[PDB]
């Protein structure tokens, strides 16, 4: 009943693999719906073709800025920003999917995939999903990151959508 979405990753145009994600629509329905709809592109905009602009090995992979491709843009299906829905779920380890933001109630489209336990983000960032398949592809992506987050190659979401 919780949606599964997938991302097909490419590194400088060449296919790397697929990562799928379970979205916790049961606990964070509004946040889960925003990610799901941007993954299918059904509202007319979304993640397809966008890049992961910030990857820091041992911490996280960040993407979701489909309008400025660098951390300064993006928007939700509800408008520019939307509220923190709740903080029920915690950043308990690698594989966690969480919303990036710029302050309270400033969720747009940017998100990060944790590759480590990041307990200090609890109560500041809304957790809404986790990697279901392809954690090994997220580990492969990390090796293209760096300490300041700049990627040595262009990491893009070549395709995305809903599996269930």
From Swiss-Prot:
Keywords: Acetylation, Apoptosis, Cytoplasm, Glycoprotein, Host-virus interaction, Isomerase, Isopeptide bond, Nucleus, Phosphoprotein, Rotamase, Secreted, Ubl conjugation. Changing residue 125 to A: Loss of peptidyl-prolyl cis-trans isomerase activity and interaction with HCV NS5A. Loss of ability to stimulate MAPK/ERK phosphorylation. Changing residue 120 to H: No effect on peptidyl-prolyl cis-trans isomerase activity. There is a cross-link at residue 27 (Glycyl lysine isopeptide (Lys-Gly) (interchain with G-Cter in ubiquitin)). Residues 6-162 form the PPIase cyclophilin-type domain. Changing residue 120 to E: Loss of peptidyl-prolyl cis-trans isomerase activity. GO terms for cellular component: cytoplasm; cytosol; extracellular exosome; extracellular region; extracellular space; ficolin-1-rich granule lumen; focal adhesion; membrane. Signal peptide: none annotated. Its EC number is 5.2.1.8. Changing residue 120 to A: 200-fold decrease of sensitivity to CsA. Reduced ability to stimulate MAPK/ERK phosphorylation. Changing residue 112 to A: Reduced ability to stimulate MAPK/ERK phosphorylation. It is an enzyme of class 5 (isomerase). One of its GO terms (biological process) is viral release from host cell. It is found in: Cytoplasm; Secreted; Nucleus. Binds cyclosporin A (CsA). CsA mediates some of its effects via an inhibitory action on PPIase. The modification N-acetylvaline is found at residue 1. Interacts with protein phosphatase PPP3CA/calcineurin A. Interacts with PRPF19 isoform 2 (via N-terminus). Interacts with isoform 2 of BSG/CD147. Interacts with FOXO1; the interaction promotes FOXO1 dephosphorylation, nuclear accumulation and transcriptional activity. Interacts with integrin ITGA2B:ITGB3; the interaction is ROS and peptidyl-prolyl cis-trans isomerase (PPIase) activity-dependent and is increased in the presence of thrombin. Interacts with MAP3K5. (Microbial infection) Interacts with HIV-1 capsid protein. Catalyzes the cis-trans isomerization of proline imidic peptide bonds in oligopeptides. Exerts a strong chemotactic effect on leukocytes partly through activation of one of its membrane receptors BSG/CD147, initiating a signaling cascade that culminates in MAPK/ERK activation. Activates endothelial cells (ECs) in a pro-inflammatory manner by stimulating activation of NF-kappa-B and ERK, JNK and p38 MAP-kinases and by inducing expression of adhesion molecules including SELE and VCAM1. (Microbial infection) May act as a mediator between human SARS coronavirus nucleoprotein and BSG/CD147 in the process of invasion of host cells by the virus. Belongs to the cyclophilin-type PPIase family. PPIase A subfamily. This is Peptidyl-prolyl cis-trans isomerase A. It comes from Homo sapiens (Human). The lineage of its organism: Eukaryota, Metazoa, Chordata, Craniata, Vertebrata.
């Amino acid at each position: 009943v919780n949606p599964t979405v997938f991302f097909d990753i490419a590194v400088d145009g060449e296919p790397l693999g697929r990562v799928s994600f379970e979205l916790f629509a049961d606990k964070v329905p509004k946040t889960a719906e925003n990610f799901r709809a941007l993954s299918t592109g059904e509202k007319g905009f979304g993640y397809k073709g966008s890049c992961f602009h910030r990857i820091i090995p041992g911490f996280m992979c960040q993407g979701g800025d489909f309008t400025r491709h660098n951390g300064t843009g993006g928007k939700s299906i509800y408008g520019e920003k939307f509220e923190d829905e709740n903080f029920i779920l915690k950043h308990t380890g690698p594989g966690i999917l969480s919303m990036a933001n710029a302050g309270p109630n400033t969720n747009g489209s940017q998100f990060f995939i944790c590759t480590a336990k990041t307990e200090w983000l609890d109560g500041k960032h809304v957790v809404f999903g986790k990697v279901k398949e392809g954690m090994n592809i997220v580990e492969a992506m990390e090796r293209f990151g760096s300490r300041n987050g700049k990627t040595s190659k262009k990491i893009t979401i070549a395709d995305c959508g809903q599996l269930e």
